[PDB]
Design a protein around this ligand. Sequence first.
Ligand code: HEM
Ligand code: HEM
Ligand SMILES: [Mg+2]
Ligand SMILES: [Mg+2]
Lengths: 298, 301
Amino acid sequence: QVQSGILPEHCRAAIWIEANLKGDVNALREASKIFVDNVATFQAKFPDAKLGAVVAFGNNVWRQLSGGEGADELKDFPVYGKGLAPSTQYDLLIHILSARHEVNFSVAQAALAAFGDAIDVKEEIHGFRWVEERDLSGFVDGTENPAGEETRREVAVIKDGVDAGGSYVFVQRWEHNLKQLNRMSVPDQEMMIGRTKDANEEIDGDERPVTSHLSRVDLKEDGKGLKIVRQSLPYGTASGTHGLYFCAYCARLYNIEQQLLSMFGDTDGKRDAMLRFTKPVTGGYYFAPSLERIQALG
Amino acid sequence: GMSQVQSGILPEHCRAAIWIEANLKGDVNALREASKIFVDNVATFQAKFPDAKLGAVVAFGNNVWRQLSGGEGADELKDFPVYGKGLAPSTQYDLLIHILSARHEVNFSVAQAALAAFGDAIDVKEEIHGFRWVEERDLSGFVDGTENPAGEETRREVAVIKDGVDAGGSYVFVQRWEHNLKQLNRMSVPDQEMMIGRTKDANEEIDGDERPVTSHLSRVDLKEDGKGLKIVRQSLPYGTASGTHGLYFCAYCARLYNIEQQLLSMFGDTDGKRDAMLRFTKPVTGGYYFAPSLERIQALG
Ligand code: HEM
Ligand code: HEM
Ligand SMILES: [Mg+2]
Ligand SMILES: [Mg+2]
């Protein structure tokens, strides 16, 4: 029932394509069915790749496709922190992930053939897992991510009603300034993130700044954690732009928005300490319907 | 009292590579310590990631190599010329950095080390991330590598200078191609096959007398009194599905001559005919470099 790209863990590479609709929204209906069948064919051909993919839609095209039914939290991505976090809301998101970049490339080609000239590709980012699953800053990324299919479903997959099997998606490309990061002492970097660098040990919440990344995004409501399923990867060239392509899935958009409001100063006027070396340059919210829902479009 | 080849020339079947092309911004002196630091970094990464099967090459353009060598050796080295009156453009830079291994993430760390070693002494012009595609095929859908020299023994014979001051060194050629896959897909599979000189699916050679003289194999499979002009290719696909994509062409040879003769052939300087691949892809960069032996990089001071 769930689209194949949400639940796989420990992918080695991914491709994200963000696009606008140029043609009529009805063109996305046939295109989506073609592509999900393509993914099924690639999984059969490369079973070792552990390949998954997701097709998600922006608010305006999803309202049209759904006839206004369900996805009650969906909205265009707003700016956060009054512009600290920019907004680049598009109509279509394609997320391909697997153990093999060469398979992801063939699948991305299939996606483009399926949608054809109905879409205008605005962004295409090739993510790769770095050494020790670390972000390019040198800090491990993923330790507190939900682990196992059971918990990942609980966090990311809508449980019942019209949207059952669906998920909300958030994508945001960050540009790292490693020169600025490298100017910081390792203890200062550690207080910035909220975990030790080499050992990847949590720094006690009582002993780290409230502006530390963990203090900004490890949020609880009466003791219940606001969890998300992250699929982020490093990207770029060593000599050009590089950073983290941030990608999160959640059965509720609420959990993601609460973390953004926190990071960008809207909740308590304090900003994420990571903004001293990295900045977000894109931002979008998308709705990932279930496989049955996609089949039921056309 | 002998020479050691740089680690990135001979490895076969590497799945990933990084190529950095840069110009020298200051005194050529800057390149001496940077190069020694960089090859030391490579040894460090080889020790930490033994399963990466990592190799790298540092190679120099004509002008800076003449300065670093004091004009001794590298007799065939010269700035890459235009071929075919401009059909093959020329983008001769001062420094080439070729990293290849089984792991892209390790290549990325090595590329960061290369940039930290040379620092603001260089101006990076190109940084290309190559990846092996399905069945070792070029993005055109044709297998790339079948007649490439196979095994360490033959690869050394073809790529590595055997004696004299340059023993252990090699000449390198890099050329980035931009594929127009829409133009390629307009062609019937039989026309594509006549363009390359091999069948697409099964990768069978089409006989020399059955295929046009403009076929890729007819252009580059050259013999001088029965002796093939062989080269060691390290080319890989690169790019995005929706953006620029193609083949990053890279070849090593004990003699620049073998490479130049294939380029004169492809670009119409030899017999006035040109490579049929120019019907769907074109070259947008081009340079020649000298890859010294590992010890000569250690005699840089
Ligand atoms: C520059 C961009 C970012 C980088 C480099 C980054 C890095 C990290 C690192 C190093 C960790 C600790 C290891 C772990 O548990 O994964 C982490 C945790 C986390 N990040 Fe980020 N992150 C980034 C952006 C974001 C954004 C935009 C969000 C939310 C909208 C987010 C939400 C989280 C969450 C929920 C955790 C787990 C916190 C916990 O429960 O301990 N991160 N991040
Ligand atoms: C668009 C750029 C290029 C593509 C797509 C390409 C593709 C191919 C393909 C499909 C083959 C046949 C399989 C094989 O034996 O490896 C091949 C062979 C070869 N290519 Fe290219 N090639 C390109 C550029 C070049 C260039 C620039 C040179 C030389 C300067 C070159 C020299 C060779 C050689 C020597 C062979 C082996 C020929 C033989 O002995 O049968 N190629 N190439
Ligand atoms: Mg916690
Ligand atoms: Mg032959």
